[PDB]
Design a protein around this nucleic acid. Sequence first.
RNA 1: AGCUUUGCGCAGUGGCAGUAUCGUAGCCAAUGAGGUUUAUCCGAGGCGCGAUUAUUGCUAAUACUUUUCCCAAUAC
Length: 48
Amino acid sequence: TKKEQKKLRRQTRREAQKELQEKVRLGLMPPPEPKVRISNLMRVLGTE
RNA sequence: AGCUUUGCGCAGUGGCAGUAUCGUAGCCAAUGAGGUUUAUCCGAGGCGCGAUUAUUGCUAAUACUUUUCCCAAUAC
């Protein structure tokens, strides 16, 4: 069903992101960088 | 051999709103949920409960003194 498909997709995404965050918690993958863009150039790296 | 439609995944680029998002070994539901209008007509979720910054994670802001050397005859 549409609800079952959406539920399956959501569970898969949550499992993937939870495993990724556990990997980040255990040094296997360095912590994510802020997603800087042109509009983000001055909120993240203003002084720089 | 291109063109193109539908649904589903993975992404990328955006825009919009935080009075909403999610859960449902709880209950009911196309053998019909819900019906205010269009009712011899429409046609799906609804109720109860639970979590919460009205989804959830991170990142950052909120500091200096241990050590270690010393005075002396060309003489009764």
